[PDB]
Amino acid sequence: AGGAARPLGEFICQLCKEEYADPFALAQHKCSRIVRVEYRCPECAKVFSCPANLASHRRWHKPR
Ligand SMILES: [Zn+2]
Ligand SMILES: [Zn+2]
């Protein structure tokens, strides 16, 4: 898990989409992200480089 997580210290950019809860990483925050096709899943934090398998992966999160 990690602990009691919520929007505290974290800046989430709209354009570069970089997100850091670590205050040191906001001081080192460098806006410039080549974000072609990458989708992070909340629980399965490993990023998917494809949209189609991601859609089938959401079907895996869908109940009956
Ligand atoms: Zn940024
Ligand atoms: Zn997932």
Side-chain angles (χ1 to χ4, degrees), residues 3 6 13 15-16 23 32-33 36-37 43 51 55 58 61-62:
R6 68 284 293 230
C13 287
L15 293 305
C16 102
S32 181
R33 281 295 295 106
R36 182 63 188 174
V37 51
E43 344 71 9
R58 300 304 302 206
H61 287 284
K62 295 183 184 186

Side-chain angles (χ1 to χ4, degrees), residues 14-27:
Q14 297 71 31
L15 293 305
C16 102
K17 210 206 69 55
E18 285 162 58
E19 48 178 276
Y20 306 110
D22 300 278
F24 305 95
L26 288 309

Side-chain angles (χ1 to χ4, degrees), residues 29-45:
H29 193 135
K30 45 181 65 181
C31 292
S32 181
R33 281 295 295 106
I34 182 63
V35 51
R36 182 63 188 174
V37 51
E38 46 179 82
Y39 301 94
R40 181 186 299 178
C41 192
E43 344 71 9
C44 338

